[PDB]
Amino acid sequence: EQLTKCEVFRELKDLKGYGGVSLPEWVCTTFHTSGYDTQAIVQNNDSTEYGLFQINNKIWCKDDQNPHSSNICNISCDKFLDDDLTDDIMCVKKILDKVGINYWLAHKALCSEKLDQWLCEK
Ligand SMILES: [Ca+2]
């Protein structure tokens, strides 16, 4: 499910300013993390990342590949592949509170400058 820039802008409302991260920074971070695809699945080494935010199953959510996950978000990873981003966002908040925005390697590298390009109107 490939969302558009403004659909992401609209759906990530509850993250606005959280942890001091602006909405524009989030639209930018999710693109360079999953390309706006809520069904994105990437697995490198002993880890598989899920959804729009690419939440790993190493410590955030539990899945099949790793039953022994810390599962800090207390949720099955498959819940990060549907169209409802509510539970994804709740988990993102736990990630921000704990490891911070740097979980998303893309934020520092490309989403800390030039943010106006990522805004929407109306
Ligand atoms: Ca979800």
UniProtKB/Swiss-Prot annotation:
Keyword Signal listed: yes
One Pfam assignment: Lys
GO cellular component, one term: extracellular space
Subcellular location field: Secreted
Domain C-type lysozyme, chain residue ranges per copy: 1-122
Tissue expression remark: Mammary gland specific. Secreted in milk.
Gene Ontology biological-process annotations: defense response to Gram-negative bacterium; defense response to Gram-positive bacterium; lactose biosynthetic process; response to 11-deoxycorticosterone; response to dehydroepiandrosterone; response to estradiol; response to progesterone
Positions bound to Ca(2+): K79, D82, D84, D87, D88
Keyword line: Allergen, Calcium, Disulfide bond, Glycoprotein, Lactose biosynthesis, Metal-binding, Milk protein, Secreted, Signal
Glycosylated residues in this chain: N45
Disulfide bonds: C6-C120, C28-C111, C61-C77, C73-C91
Family listed: Belongs to the glycosyl hydrolase 22 family.
Function: Regulatory subunit of lactose synthase, changes the substrate specificity of galactosyltransferase in the mammary gland making glucose a good acceptor substrate for this enzyme. This enables LS to synthesize lactose, the major carbohydrate component of milk. In other tissues, galactosyltransferase transfers galactose onto the N-acetylglucosamine of the oligosaccharide chains in glycoproteins.
Protein name (Swiss-Prot/TrEMBL): Alpha-lactalbumin
Lineage, opening ranks: Eukaryota, Metazoa, Chordata, Craniata, Vertebrata
